[PDB]
């Protein structure tokens, strides 16, 4: 592939189907294996196409371990708000676009397509508010249905030129510096030249496109969650292959018998094999020949084939840096500080995606206000997203470790409502408008002292009695 | 559960699509609605115009199941409502398809015929786009939609052939059986499989003999039977894990674990059911959206930031969340009015209640209010004091 | 990068803030879950003449105090 | 690599030989025709019910123990 200077205004079509669509298939058939993968159904290393059976066991032991962990990761990941420098309150600007575009139910999808494939995208466009004002539509896009090209791929914050493909199978988009170009797509791998192309100068400036990478790396090889443990979940998935193999070929203690005749009942042409042979606890076997011998073959133990799993799930949850508890075993007494160890390394990795996916956030925000001029949140570059905590301390601990800090150290007890589990920003704001409040339960509810109500309505009862 | 509508800086539920939730029996529709769109992968809300039963405008509200419908959208990823729907009646009668702004019905005799005799109903209520809301499971940025059941198929399987494999043993090879050799055969006049009721009576006083120094009884052993069991115990702990739900609710009993520790365990499942927490209640702000908008209300319609709320789904006992509530209340000074709605066992309608009966002039409530551990205190304490000193 | 519980943390840090009378400006961004920006958001918001910072300031465990528990005071005296 | 090389040597004792190995001595050979490979889904039925027995007394049936698969687990852990 090469990076063309010009944007072939008359012959962009060329262009993209001789050095776009190979590269853009070459890479969307990786994605469509890994998003398979991801879902279930783990690279089988070894699987016998001669044996309906055993191919019927090795798909009944393909274990979805990599989804779950897909999953975990991305259920733990929430934006909630946008704190700017020196403001404890949500700017009224890339908030009100965010609250409007769904954004809370789009990020868990985007964060779980970052971890998966490596690289999420996020599509902000201008357009027209419910009112009629402006109104940035942000949107994203899997790698899948995407390739954007970047000629310096460690840096480069927005790409040059990338071709996007609508869910639909029906239009190819090509994304300019400035103008929208549309094709049409009747049916996959045909770009007739009849079709005019459409070109919209709606105006954004560079190419409006945010890569949400997964781990930042100096010398690019982005990867996703699910690549990196590939050969791990194939070998947990083959222990259970083998260990279904055992219980199902030999776990039973084989009854044999030697000495007697053979080719009874009438020479048995494999005809009437509805034999029937009763054979209970009553029932006792015997024959009429002394040189008859029944012998019984041990089965396999069944024992070593846990004991494997279970070590490959461990491995499977230290290497991702996933509590083991949360994938095999039992959690033990653990206490305050033997737990924040256990999970310290979830912690960590957890913060990091947070801090790579805020920055992503940050540069999806600071597109979206540019879009409709306010120049205020372009010039910000401080202004960083806040997420919710992730944190595995019980409510009581942490509610009397911050009311001890309130207490003592002085802090902020404003700050301190939104870190108590189970409160969210919304509740804040709803405490915030309401706290001092006219009505009888506020103001009973404020002064309230141990021994009934306090302040003026425990005031006036004095002042009564003094009069 | 959903349980009130609080909008952005009220702490009271709107006057508006609460009373179109309420009256059209949701809460007990919901759990279905969940159920369907936790097992099939996507429920399907269905919003109509109706009148109430003073004469006003009702919203009626119905969930169908993926079974009984069909959605197409143009884009899948993001549509909000689809742009035509066949929706097939629990009856079996009548086929409806659901146009943007006509109500098209038709009929259904017999289970694939569509005779042209019948005259096709069209009915112009009014909604504006496709009144269907979409109850996703999971949200994923290239579709692939699909249910909780679906993923864990296999794991499933698994532990029912592992079932069926520890039955297989206990059910053909599990006690000893007792052989014996040497003794002659064809007995009892070349049984012919005649008179099966043998009745050779076996105890423990009977003590077996035979006419012959050439005879030996053997014994097979049988099948140990543990290995089944840790196999079927690792499965079930396998299926719970995949699908972040608690071990000790499916195999097993809970050890004595600490705060912190239920807290661990606990917390991938809280996590899931929060992110399907938020996903659920954007579905229904959607819904609630819809359901204002059909009956006027610009306030419902333009209000994009009301959101609903949910029952706290947390696994922590009463005396502990009871006293960190306090001393939160007493030290950090959180208002106490919306704490009453995070202990266990109250409701929104108790704190209704609370709120609605909290100062009243009878003296049930004046005695309990001004409350001291020596007695009343308050104005009935007053009037002793004021009493005493005249 | 301490692998301290916050509770334990935040206890002894407490106490040492009001035994050995350490700086409890800097203290604030020692407990795990507060960074720089949040240190500085309650130092630009800590004597806001909005009601909620005065009322959470001014805090005591038998309702607000200050000039707020100050006012009914005087309205008695009064 | 020594980590990956002991993880290797599990693999290898649990695909090739982990399983009671069931043989039998005595009985004849060269059966099904002089087999040349052909039609080698015999499907031998064999289950819990079923029963094997032979046509000659001098028919022995063996059983080859497995390896424990302990040692490796003890192994890879240190």
Same mark, same amino acid.
């Given at each position: 592939?090469?990076?063309? +200077?010009? !944007?072939? &205004?008359?012959?962009?079509?060329?262009?993209? /189907?001789?050095?776009?669509?190979?590269?853009? %298939? $070459?890479?969307?058939?990786?994605?469509?294996?890994?998003?398979?993968?991801?879902?279930?159904?783990?690279?089988?290393?070894?699987?016998?196409?001669?044996?309906?059976?055993?191919?019927?066991?090795?798909?009944?032991?393909?274990?979805?371990?990599?989804?779950?962990?897909?999953?975990?990761?991305?259920?733990?990941?929430?934006?909630?708000?946008?704190?700017?420098?020196?403001?404890?309150?949500?700017?009224?600007?890339?908030?009100?676009?965010?609250?409007?575009?769904?954004?809370?139910?789009?990020?868990?999808?985007?964060?779980?397509?970052?971890?998966?494939?490596?690289?999420?995208?996020?599509?902000?466009?201008?357009?027209?508010?419910?009112?009629?004002?402006?109104?940035?539509?942000?949107?994203?896009?899997?790698?899948?249905?995407?390739?954007?090209?970047?000629? +310096?791929? !460690?840096? &480069?914050?927005?790409?040059?030129?990338?071709? /996007?493909?609508?869910?639909?199978?029906?239009? %190819? $988009?090509?994304?300019?510096?400035?103008?929208?170009?549309?094709?049409?797509?009747?049916?996959?791998?045909?770009?007739?030249?009849?079709?005019?192309?459409?070109?919209?100068?709606?105006?954004?400036?560079?190419?409006?496109?945010?890569?949400?990478?997964?781990?930042?790396?100096?010398?690019?090889?982005?990867?996703?969650?699910?690549?990196?443990?590939?050969?791990?979940?194939?070998?947990?998935?083959?222990?259970?292959?083998?260990?279904?193999?055992?219980?199902?070929?030999?776990?039973?203690?084989?009854?044999?018998?030697?000495?007697?005749?053979?080719?009874?009942?009438?020479?048995?042409?494999?005809?009437?094999?509805?034999?029937?042979?009763?054979?209970?606890?009553?029932?006792?076997?015997?024959?009429?020949?002394?040189?008859?011998?029944?012998?019984?073959?041990?089965?396999?133990?069944? &024992?070593?084939?846990?004991?494997?799993?279970?070590?490959?799930?461990?491995?499977?949850?230290?290497?991702?840096?996933?509590?083991?508890?949360?994938?095999?075993?039992?959690?033990?007494?653990?206490?305050?500080?033997?737990?924040?160890?256990?999970?310290?390394?979830?912690?960590?990795?957890?913060?990091?995606?947070?801090?790579?996916?805020?920055?992503?956030?940050?540069?999806?925000?600071?597109?979206?206000?540019?879009?409709?001029?306010?120049?205020?949140?372009?010039?910000?570059?401080?202004?960083?997203?806040?997420?919710?905590?992730?944190?595995?301390?019980?409510?009581?601990?942490?509610?009397?470790?911050?009311?001890?800090?309130?207490?003592?150290?002085?802090?902020?007890?404003?700050?301190?409502?939104?870190?108590?589990?189970?409160?969210?920003?919304?509740?804040?704001?709803?405490?915030?408008?309401?706290?001092?409040?006219?009505?009888?339960?506020?103001?009973?509810?404020?002064?309230?002292?141990?021994?009934?109500?306090?302040?003026?309505?425990?005031?006036?009862?004095?002042?009564?009695?003094?009069?």
């Amino acid at each position: 592939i090469e990076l063309p +200077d010009a !944007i072939s &205004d008359g012959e962009v079509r060329k262009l993209v /189907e001789n050095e776009f669509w190979p590269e853009f %298939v $070459r890479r969307r058939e990786k994605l469509d294996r890994i998003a398979q993968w991801a879902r279930g159904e783990q690279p089988d290393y070894l699987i016998q196409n001669a044996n309906r059976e055993k191919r019927a066991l090795l798909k009944l032991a393909k274990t979805p371990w990599l989804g779950l962990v897909v999953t975990h990761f991305t259920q733990a990941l929430f934006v909630d708000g946008y704190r700017a420098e020196g403001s404890k309150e949500n700017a009224k600007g890339p908030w009100q676009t965010w609250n409007a575009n769904k954004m809370q139910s789009k990020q868990i999808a985007i964060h779980r397509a970052a971890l998966t494939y490596g690289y999420s995208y996020a599509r902000v466009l201008p357009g027209v508010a419910l009112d009629g004002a402006n109104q940035a539509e942000i949107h994203g896009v899997s790698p899948r249905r995407l390739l954007a090209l970047y000629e +310096d791929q !460690i840096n &480069d914050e927005y790409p040059k030129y990338a071709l /996007e493909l609508a869910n639909n199978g029906k239009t %190819v $988009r090509l994304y300019t510096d400035t103008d929208y170009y549309e094709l049409r797509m009747p049916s996959p791998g045909n770009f007739p030249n009849e079709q005019v192309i459409k070109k919209v100068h709606h105006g954004v400036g560079v190419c409006p496109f945010v890569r949400y990478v997964n781990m930042m790396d100096l010398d690019g090889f982005t990867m996703g969650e699910v690549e990196y443990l590939v050969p791990v979940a194939s070998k947990i998935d083959k222990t259970d292959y083998d260990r279904l193999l055992a219980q199902h070929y030999n776990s039973w203690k084989v009854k044999v018998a030697t000495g007697i005749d053979d080719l009874s009942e009438d020479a048995t042409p494999e005809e009437q094999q509805r034999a029937k042979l009763i054979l209970a606890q009553d029932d006792i076997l015997m024959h009429g020949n002394h040189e008859a011998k029944f012998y019984t073959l041990p089965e396999t133990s069944l &024992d070593g084939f846990i004991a494997a799993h279970t070590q490959d799930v461990e491995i499977l949850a230290n290497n991702a840096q996933v509590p083991v508890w949360i994938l095999n075993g039992q959690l033990a007494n653990l206490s305050a500080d033997a737990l924040t160890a256990a999970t310290k390394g979830t912690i960590q990795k957890l913060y990091e995606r947070q801090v790579t996916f805020g920055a992503a956030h940050n540069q999806v925000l600071r597109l979206a206000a540019h879009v409709e001029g306010d120049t205020e949140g372009a010039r910000d570059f401080t202004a960083s997203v806040s997420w919710q905590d992730t944190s595995v301390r019980s409510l009581a601990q942490a509610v009397d470790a911050y009311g001890k800090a309130a207490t003592m150290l002085g802090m902020p007890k404003e700050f301190l409502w939104g870190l108590i589990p189970g409160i969210t920003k919304t509740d804040v704001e709803a405490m915030r408008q309401h706290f001092n409040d006219d009505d009888e339960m506020t103001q009973m509810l404020l002064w309230w002292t141990p021994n009934g109500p306090g302040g003026e309505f425990a005031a006036e009862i004095e002042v009564d009695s003094q009069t």
